[PDB]
Ligand binder design. Structure first.
Ligand SMILES: CCCCCCCCCCCCCCCC(=O)O
Ligand SMILES: [Br-]
Ligand SMILES: [Br-]
Ligand SMILES: [Br-]
Ligand SMILES: [Br-]
Ligand SMILES: [Br-]
Ligand SMILES: [Br-]
Ligand SMILES: [Br-]
Length: 282
């Protein structure tokens, strides 16, 4: 029956060729520099970001997409589609989600179904892949697709570490956590999402130990022998990510592994040297 489009914001970091394969449209968030503000992924790739930042001593900030651009995308989309699955980074770390919702009453020709992925990066990307796959196999209810995504959210996991805690501190997305701890985070932990916001998952002494702990955490799901997607995400640490994927994929042939990155908007908050691993059931 009805035609359903799929949208995600840039911070899902789905490779552009893969988005084309799967019919996934994308709305960029912004990275703000001293002179220029860019639309990430389209106007600034991840290597340029980390290169620009260190060779200009940039202290970038980020912005959600202008509500105007969301509306324009939906209006355009609505000429060929009845509904859009609009998938976004956590409502606890960005106003993007709530702008997608508010943009729905601003467009007549399409029904927007905002989905709070309560996460970001390729973990959020995974929801858009599932949505496209469902749509490809004749999913004709936007509601049924959303139900599907919410169930999948039950088993999506992500753990990550940063090199310098200062970037997160600066961007403000450790506020909730620190509001609950009652004080200031000084030592680097494993981080994860809990109730839509970033919080320490566990105290750890070294990055090496953090990775090994995350391996254990992955094994808990990877050991069931059920089909999975997983991504090792880096902020300018591609070789390190590749060694991890080399070792992990050998160990888990049933887990499809992606080498992915923190782009300009997310890397603005995590900082170069950040590393994480996420996964979910296919
Ligand atoms: C493999 C692990 C992936 C986990 C994803 C971590 C996301 C980093 C959180 C901080 C970024 C906040 C973005 C704010 C954008 C805006 O200004 O609205
Ligand atoms: Br792009
Ligand atoms: Br329409
Ligand atoms: Br509408
Ligand atoms: Br479905
Ligand atoms: Br630090
Ligand atoms: Br926060
Ligand atoms: Br660490």
């Amino acid at each position: 029956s009805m035609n359903i489009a799929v949208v995600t914001d840039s911070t899902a970091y789905i490779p552009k060729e893969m988005r084309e394969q799967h019919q996934i449209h994308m709305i960029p968030l912004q990275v703000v520099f001293r002179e220029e503000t860019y639309r990430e992924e389209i106007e600034l790739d991840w290597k340029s970001f980390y290169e620009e930042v260190k060779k200009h001593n940039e202290l970038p900030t980020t912005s959600q997409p202008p509500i105007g651009e969301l509306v324009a995308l939906y209006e355009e989309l609505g000429k060929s589609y009845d509904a859009v699955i609009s998938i976004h980074l956590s409502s606890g770390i960005s106003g993007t989600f709530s702008s997608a919702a508010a943009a729905d009453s601003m467009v007549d020709n399409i029904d927007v179904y905002p989905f709070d992925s309560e996460i970001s990066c390729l973990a959020q990307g995974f929801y858009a892949l599932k949505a496209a796959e469902l749509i490809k196999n004749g999913a004709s209810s936007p509601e049924d697709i959303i139900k599907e995504l919410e169930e999948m959210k039950k088993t999506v996991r992500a753990y990550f570490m940063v090199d310098d805690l200062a970037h997160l501190q600066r961007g403000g997305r450790l506020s909730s956590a620190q509001a609950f701890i009652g004080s200031l985070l000084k030592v680097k932990p494993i981080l994860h999402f809990d109730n839509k916001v970033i919080v320490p998952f566990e105290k750890i002494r070294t990055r090496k130990k953090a990775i090994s702990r995350i391996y254990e955490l992955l094994d808990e799901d990877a050991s069931k022998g059920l089909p999975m997607r997983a991504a090792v995400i880096h902020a300018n640490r591609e070789e390190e990510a590749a060694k991890i994927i080399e070792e992990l994929s050998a160990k888990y042939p049933h887990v499809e592994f992606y080498n992915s990155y923190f782009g300009a908007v997310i890397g603005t908050h995590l900082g170069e040297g950040a590393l994480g691993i996420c996964w979910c059931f296919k």
